[PDB]
Amino acid sequence: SSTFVDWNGPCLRLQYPLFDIEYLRSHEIYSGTPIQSISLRTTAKLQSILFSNYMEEYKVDFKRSTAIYNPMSEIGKLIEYSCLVFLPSPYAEQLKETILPDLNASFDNSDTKGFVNAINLYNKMIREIPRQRIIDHLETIDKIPRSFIHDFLHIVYTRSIHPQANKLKHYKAFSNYVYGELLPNFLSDVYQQCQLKKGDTFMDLGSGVGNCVVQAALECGCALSFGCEIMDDASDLTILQYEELKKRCKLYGMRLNNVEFSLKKSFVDNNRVAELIPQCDVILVNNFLFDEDLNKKVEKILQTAKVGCKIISLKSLRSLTYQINFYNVENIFNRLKVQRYDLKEDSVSWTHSGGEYYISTVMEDVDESLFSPARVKYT
Ligand SMILES: Nc1ncnc2c1ncn2[C@@H]1O[C@H](CSCC[C@H](N)C(=O)O)[C@@H](O)[C@H]1O
């Protein structure tokens, strides 16, 4: 017996108004146009928990592949999240005992008819709950499963990025533009280590399709989550994903703080990047495949960072043998505290295990030390 979500996972503390209660109380009809899963390439419709008029159709096939994007897996997670997060006692009980056991078994056994029956039973039960009870409950939530945002973002991702993922892997003349992804759990760990919080400014130099930027906004409520990406197709996919994300957020009454991108342009000699650096609290840069030249450019860009700013990277920013001399006396690298960490399993897309990452903090004074002596179920 297993669950679609880890009911024992870590819970995230909400440090900003994630659910817009007034919006929900004033909006009962969803008019958004989210990408329906069934449009990607037996069926069942999943009834929206908050909007009576919304239902999404999923293709249900335990034979036809599955794996990577698994429609049934998403449903299992959504239905469980209802029981875990969106329902008030008592209904959370009825749902928990009445649907989950059969939903999970039917799944594990590749039992189509049983799986669909559990879904249809889930829909019937959900429609019997007074809407205002669900909303009144959301209003009390102060903590949520760390996996919620991850799974919520994965849904958006399966809909907007996955279908055209191949466009992100076109022949790369330079390693500088090779696409690599930092994964959700790694991002969650690192944002926490840097204490990314409400009102902060977050920047991702080389944002890819925006995964790191949107996660920063959703899980920390940053005043501004910004990303710059130069590749054309990564940039188009960023727009599609961003668009789908806004619709899904509305479907769940979630607030999405300011998200901004500087697309199809270099972050080098980028005036918006330059004007934002000084106010950034956290700067992320996956320089794993960056060459010496580019790293030098990144170095230049970071010169105006403020005291306290934390920079996350996969390769140290400062040469391991960086010693203060006479040609680098004013470089911000001189007052940067560097801390190395081991990469946990499956933190990045290019490797299963191994590796490391760094968190460099901008300190007020210089470091004397530098002077010379003289993309699965649970139990
Ligand atoms: N000068 C430059 N300006 C903007 N983006 C650049 C750049 N040099 C490299 N990049 C981009 O930086 C990206 C980093 S790989 C993606 C990282 C992204 N932070 C994520 O975790 O999903 C590459 O896809 C590449 O397109």
Curated annotation (Swiss-Prot):
Regulation of protein activity: Ubiquitination of histone H2B by the RAD6/UBC2-BRE1 complex to form H2BK123ub1 is required for efficient DOT1 methyltransferase activity on histone H3. Interaction with DNA is required for optimal histone methyltransferase activity.
GO terms for MF: DNA binding; histone binding; histone H3K79 methyltransferase activity; histone H3K79 trimethyltransferase activity
Enzyme Commission no: 2.1.1.360
Main location as per UniProt: nucleus
Binding positions for S-adenosyl-L-methionine per the UniProt entry: 179-182, 202-211, 229, 266-267
Substitution effect: Y179F: Reduces methyltransferase activity
Misc. comment: In contrast to other lysine histone methyltransferases, it does not contain a SET domain, suggesting the existence of another mechanism for methylation of lysine residues of histones. Present with 2160 molecules/cell in log phase SD medium.
The protein, known as: Histone-lysine N-methyltransferase, H3 lysine-79 specific
Native organism: Saccharomyces cerevisiae (strain ATCC 204508 / S288c)
Upper lineage: Eukaryota, Fungi, Dikarya, Ascomycota, Saccharomycotina
Residues of the full protein shown: 176 to 581 of 582
